[PDB]
Specification:
This is part of a larger assembly, with 3 copies of chain A.
Chain A: H1 2-5, H2 9-27, E1 42-48, H3 54-67, E2 75-82, E3 87-94, H4 100-114, H5 120-125, E4 127-131, E5 138-144, H6 151-161, H7 163-167, E6 175-177, E7 182-188, H8 190-195, H9 200-210, E8 218-219, E9 232-235, H10 243-247, E10 250-253, E11 259-261, E12 267-272, E13 280-281, E14 284-291, H11 299-312, E15 321-328, H12 330-344, H13 346-358, H14 362-385, H15 392-399, H16 402-422, H17 427-453, H18 461-487, H19 489-496, H20 502-526, H21 529-549, E16 562-568, H22 575-592, E17 597-601, E18 604-606, E19 611-616, E20 619-622, H23 635-646, E21 655-658, E22 671-674, H24 683-697, E23 704-709, E24 715-722, H25 724-729, H26 734-744, E25 748-755, E26 758-766, E27 781-783, E28 789-791, H27 792-795, E29 796-803, E30 807-810, E31 813-814, E32 818-822, H28 828-839, E33 849-850, H29 852-860, H30 863-883, H31 889-893, H32 896-910, H33 916-946, H34 951-961, H35 964-976, H36 979-982, H37 988-1023
Parallel strand pairs in A: 7-26
Antiparallel strand pairs in A: 1-3, 1-4, 2-3, 2-30, 5-14, 5-15, 6-14, 7-12, 8-9, 10-11, 13-14, 16-19, 16-20, 16-21, 17-20, 18-19, 22-32, 22-33, 23-32, 24-29, 25-26, 27-28, 30-31
PDB class: transport protein
Keywords: Transmembrane Binding, Antibiotic Resistance, transport protein
Entry title: Single particle cryo-EM co-structure of Klebsiella pneumoniae AcrB with the BDM91288 efflux pump inhibitor at 3.42 Angstrom resolution
Chain lengths: 1025, 48, 43
């Protein structure tokens, strides 16, 4: 090819122009998102059973659904849990890569057949099947400045006039509402009901019948009587709308003759569907919409549209409202994307300056500036072909590839530049000879590098999803570069190049002296190859010694501008007490950190571990990065200060912590353990086993650290016993007590009604002041058989006992989530395996199982050595082909430890970790450490084979020839990726991991390789005569 | 285009005053005028 | 073996069909062109 396009310059431009256009077109169509799909698909089955104890949601809702979940393809493990608020979720996690759309409908379908088995109330409230893997693009929150309307009014307004335009915007794949629209709320009154001889059953009956609809049919509908001339539909009784109209509902007619209307027996008002959660914003009521992102839509663009549509409705907001954005991920994506383009444009400038320092001619430095961008635009078209989307992974998987692109443009141009000056051949013919020396090598580099990155793409689980992004980007960029270095660069070189004091004059004089001295040093070494082979063993052990000492992490944490703040109160703490902690928690942020904290979305009664009235959260939103100079105002520092202060709080286990790097997954740090109950021992016996395990992990503080439960400890709970014999004696149907007791205290959902063009629920529930203490049970009356009321105290016995507010299951059997992490200096593999032994001596019938990340790590860890056994062998086969021998490829492979040593030394000194970015960081160093060695050997073999020069003489010439192209590749690449190391702003956690691993590895790869590859080639050649 | 409609305002207070359940009023009106579907029957081996 | 079905395309009824099967089975009984069980799958 190079000798075909060399005399065909125009045909090279056309292919270059086509590639450039492909990138331009595909840049305007590629999706942009912070991260691609990583977590395995997960389907959540939420079911609400109002006013239900924790046990009931398990023995009638969760268990029935679990039993009927049969014949679903690619189901990896099923987990569920039922809290004390009536909500049970069943998260089904599927195999990685399975079509989530087909998975969800399959899960929904089995639920649809099992819906009749569930109680009536669960079906009435509806069961929702959602996707839990996706993460919110942003959370737009609306507040009330004037405080003239509670959250319910704000939530009702949002669901009526803000949820429609937002959900119709371009790219908004799903909008969730953090609230409930109005719902006619009827506050009953036990004192008044007993006066009029009524019971809650009567109230339910009247509502169910006086707010219905009828099908009147038609007036003169077919078949008609002969001669008809009119036809019109009939409209019969229609639902009620006004709260006053509900009051007029006639409930009873007294024997005297008076009327007993509902409004005289119960207060009626427009309230919320659920008062479980009370949101706030700097101490003001608020509600928000959780906006998600559709598959294949610009995250930056969509967040621009949403912020534009809300500007349209800004005037229409009733006085007192305002739109705030506590949590948004597009501003971070903007920085994490521009910072990359600031590097892909700095490298081009640096390559232009670096070559101009060595060659001293403008026409030479213009060849890479046109050959590097062509590949960058080209890889987008290839990247878009596979369906990938720009994100924090591919971009950081492309900054690593800039090293590969440059060295495939410096080598081609530099070698041509050397030939013209040494041999004196003309530019149009120098390229023909120059490319005749490296056309074979470059094609070989494509296969060797393709044999090192491709195996990475075959991993499994979440890690395989992250790795597949880097491997395809690097491979695509690397593959194009070789092709664009065999088709375009030769054409530009001949056409553009021309035949051939101060600072540059001095630099050449000094460089010429250095290269002459460098050849002298290698000459001295090659006469005593025995001594320096020892140093190659003292360097490999250093690599092994440091590699094991490096802690293993998943992804670095980044200052995303938002950090959570849990809040847990003792057992049974009411809503009022929690809101007192959440107010002094919000006061600290706005008082001791007024210059960093922007807002505090002080949610209440909601928690990740569980749900109830004794839990809270506060999504603290920090000021923009530009307003937080220094490290003293980063998320890491702020959290540490807050943790120190909250240790002084009494009656609350408050603790703050930053978000994970990839919020779609959990913490992804430590291990996840399930304490199954295989033998059906029961919950109480299971807890006795967990306590036994907890009291036995204490014997191993040096391996297992911070082992804690994830559920909720059992708490006191009122128990009412209906004396069956007494009830029959007094003539009260047990089916009536279960309703008065269950409707007065737990609230009931009678039917729907139409208001302002929407359908809203109707809830009946006792007034707040009559359902508080145990003494209030005796305040409720129920009609007997003869019409004489009786109190609950007459036929009900009550006592206090213990129960679990949040029962849990796993794979259909009860469990107790146990979380933890390995002790410092000990790998999770040993800590994970230790728990198996510890859990293996628990009472009979109590097994275990690993879930979450650990279940994935129990599979991915198998492939760690196997994939690199294929990679190493295939690379050797490619090298053996290139050099046409079995022994020579050893010299090339043996430089791999040289490259890694630099990365580990830099990472260890900087205190980084063996995270995902670092692992890919090594590969480019290993990939670009051999690319500099494959050419040193191939030149030495070429000189020795053709010109017949002796071995020692040939190697000395080979190193002299390849001293310039090695330095300009290392000097330009290291300077190109120096910003990524000094960076300390937004998205610096990922930049530092990539930057430090590369710059450190490159430095020792360059220095050692140019002194060792000549040693390897001679020693290998000598021994294998 | 727009068509006439025949609204039947069923006075609820009067209904109970005359001792007629609102359930009967809704069923008799719907069944009489609009026609009601009760249950299937077997005709020549087919369900109708 | 061939799975033959006597679809009743006239709404005669189950009783008539079983009556029809006997004749059709009989017509094949006197002109053997079948083997093995010639079993009926139903009850």
């Amino acid at each position: 090819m190079p000798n075909f396009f060399i005399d065909r310059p125009i045909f090279a431009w056309v292919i270059a122009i086509i590639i450039m256009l492909a990138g331009g077109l595909s840049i305007l169509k590629l999706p942009v998102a912070q991260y691609p799909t990583i977590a395995p698909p997960a389907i959540s089955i939420t079911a609400m059973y109002p006013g239900a104890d924790a046990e009931t949601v398990q023995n009638t809702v969760t268990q029935v659904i679990e039993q009927n979940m049969n014949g679903i393809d690619h189901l990896m493990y099923m987990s569920s849990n039922g809290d004390s608020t009536g909500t049970a979720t069943i998260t089904l996690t599927f195999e990685s890569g399975t079509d989530p759309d087909i998975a969800q409908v399959q899960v929904q379908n089995k639920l649809a057949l099992a819906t009749p088995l569930l109680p009536q109330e669960v079906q009435q409230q509806g069961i929702s099947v959602e996707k839990a893997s996706s993460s919110f693009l942003m959370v737009v929150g609306v507040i009330n400045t004037n405080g003239t309307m509670n959250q319910d009014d704000i939530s009702d307004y949002v669901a009526a006039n803000m949820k429609d335009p937002i959900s119709r915007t371009s790219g908004v794949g799903d909008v969730q509402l953090f609230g409930s629209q109005y719902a006619m709320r009827i506050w009953m009154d036990p004192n008044k009901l007993n006066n009029f001889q009524l019971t809650p059953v009567d109230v339910i009956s009247a509502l169910k019948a006086q707010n219905a609809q009828v099908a009147a049919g038609q007036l003169g509908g077919t078949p008609p009587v002969k001669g008809q001339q009119l036809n019109a539909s009939i409209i019969a009784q229609t639902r009620l709308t006004n709260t006053e109209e509900f009051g007029n509902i006639l409930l009873k007619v007294n024997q005297d003759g008076s009327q007993v209307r509902l409004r005289d027996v119960a207060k009626i008002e427009l309230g919320g569907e659920s008062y479980d959660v009370v949101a706030k914003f700097n101490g003001q009521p608020a509600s928000g919409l959780g906006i998600k992102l559709a598959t294949g839509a610009n995250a930056l663009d969509t967040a621009n549209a949403i912020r534009a549509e809300l500007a349209k409705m800004e005037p229409f907001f009733p006085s007192g409202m305002k739109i705030v954005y506590p949590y948004d991920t597009t501003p971070f994506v903007k920085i994490s994307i521009h910072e990359v383009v600031k590097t892909l444009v700095e490298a081009i400038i640096l390559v232009f300056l670096v070559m101009y320092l060595f060659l001293q001619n403008f026409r030479a430095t213009l060849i890479p500036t046109i050959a590097v961008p062509v590949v960058l635009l080209g890889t987008f078209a290839v990247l878009a072909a596979f369906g990938f989307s720009i994100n924090t992974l591919t971009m950081f998987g492309m900054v690593l590839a800039i090293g590969l692109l440059v060295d495939d443009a410096i080598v081609v141009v530099e070698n041509v530049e050397r030939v013209m000056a040494e041999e004196g051949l003309p530019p149009k013919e120098a390229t023909r000879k120059s490319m005749g020396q490296i056309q074979g090598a470059l094609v070989g580099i494509a296969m060797v590098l393709s044999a090192v990155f491709i195996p990475m793409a075959f991993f499994g689980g979440s890690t395989g999803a992250i790795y597949r992004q880097f491997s395809i980007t690097i491979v695509s960029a690397m593959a194009l570069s070789v092709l664009v270095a065999l088709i375009l660069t030769p054409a530009l070189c001949a056409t553009m190049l021309k035949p051939i004091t101060g600072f540059f004059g001095w630099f050449n004089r000094m460089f010429d002296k250095s290269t002459h001295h460098y050849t002298d040093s290698v000459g001295n070494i090659l006469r005593s190859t025995g001594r320096y082979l020892v140093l190659y063993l003292i360097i490999v052990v250093g690599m092994a010694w440091l590699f094991v000492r490096l802690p293993s992490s998943f992804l670095p944490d980044e200052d995303q501008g938002v950090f959570l703040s849990m809040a847990q109160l003792p057992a049974g703490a009411t809503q009022e007490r929690t809101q007192k902690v959440l107010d002094e928690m919000t006061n600290y942020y706005l008082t001791k950190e007024k210059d960093n904290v922007e807002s505090v979305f002080a949610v209440n009664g909601f928690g990740f571990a569980g749900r109830g009235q004794n839990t809270g959260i506060a999504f603290v939103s920090l000021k923009d990065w530009s307003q937080r100079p220094g490290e003293e105002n980063k998320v890491e520092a702020i959290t540490a200060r807050a943790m120190g202060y909250f240790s002084q709080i009494k009656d609350a286990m408050v603790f703050a912590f930053n978000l994970p790097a990839i919020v779609e997954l959990g913490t992804a740090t430590g291990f996840d353990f399930e304490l199954i109950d295989q033998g059906g021992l029961g919950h109480e016996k299971l807890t006795q086993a967990r306590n036994q395990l907890f009291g036995m992990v204490a014997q191993h503080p040096d391996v297992l650290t911070g082992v804690r439960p994830n559920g909720l400890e059992d708490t006191p709970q009122f128990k009412i016993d209906i004396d069956q014999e007494k009830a029959q004696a007094l003539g009260v149907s047990i089916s009536d007590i279960n309703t008065t007791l269950g409707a007065a205290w737990g609230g009931s959902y009678v039917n729907d009604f139409i208001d302002r063009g929407r359908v809203k629920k109707v809830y009946i529930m006792s007034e707040a002041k009559y359902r508080m203490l145990p003494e209030d049970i005796g305040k409720w009356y129920v009609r007997g058989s003869d019409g004489q009321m009786v109190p609950f105290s007459a036929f009900s016995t009550s006592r206090w006992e213990y129960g679990s507010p949040r029962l849990e299951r796993y794979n259909g059997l009860p469990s107790l989530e146990i979380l933890g992490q390995a002790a410092p200096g000990k790998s999770t593999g040993e800590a994970m395996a230790l728990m198996e032994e510890l859990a293996g001596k628990l009472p009979s019938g109590i097994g275990y199982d690993w879930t979450g990340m650990s279940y994935q790590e129990r599979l991915s860890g198998n492939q760690a050595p196997a994939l690199y056994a294929i990679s190493l062998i295939v690379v050797f086969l490619c090298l053996a082909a290139l050099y046409e021998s079995w022994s020579i490829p050893f010299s090339v492979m043996l430089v791999v430890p040289l490259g890694v040593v630099g990365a580990l030394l830099a990472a260890t000194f900087r205190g980084l970790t063996n995270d995902v970015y670092f692992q890919v960081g090594l590969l480019t160093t290993i990939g670009l450490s051999a690319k500099n060695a494959i050419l040193i050997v191939e030149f030495a073999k070429d000189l020795m084979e053709k010109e017949g020069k002796g071995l020692i003489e040939a190697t000395l010439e080979a190193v002299r020839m390849r001293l310039r192209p090695i330095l300009m590749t290392s000097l330009a690449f290291i300077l190109g990726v120096m910003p990524l190391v000094i960076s300390s702003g937004a998205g610096s956690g990922a930049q530092n991991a990539v930057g430090t691993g590369v710059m450190g590895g490159m430095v020792t790869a360059t220095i050692l390789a140019i002194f060792f590859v000549p040693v390897f080639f001679v020693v290998v050649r000598r021994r294998f005569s």
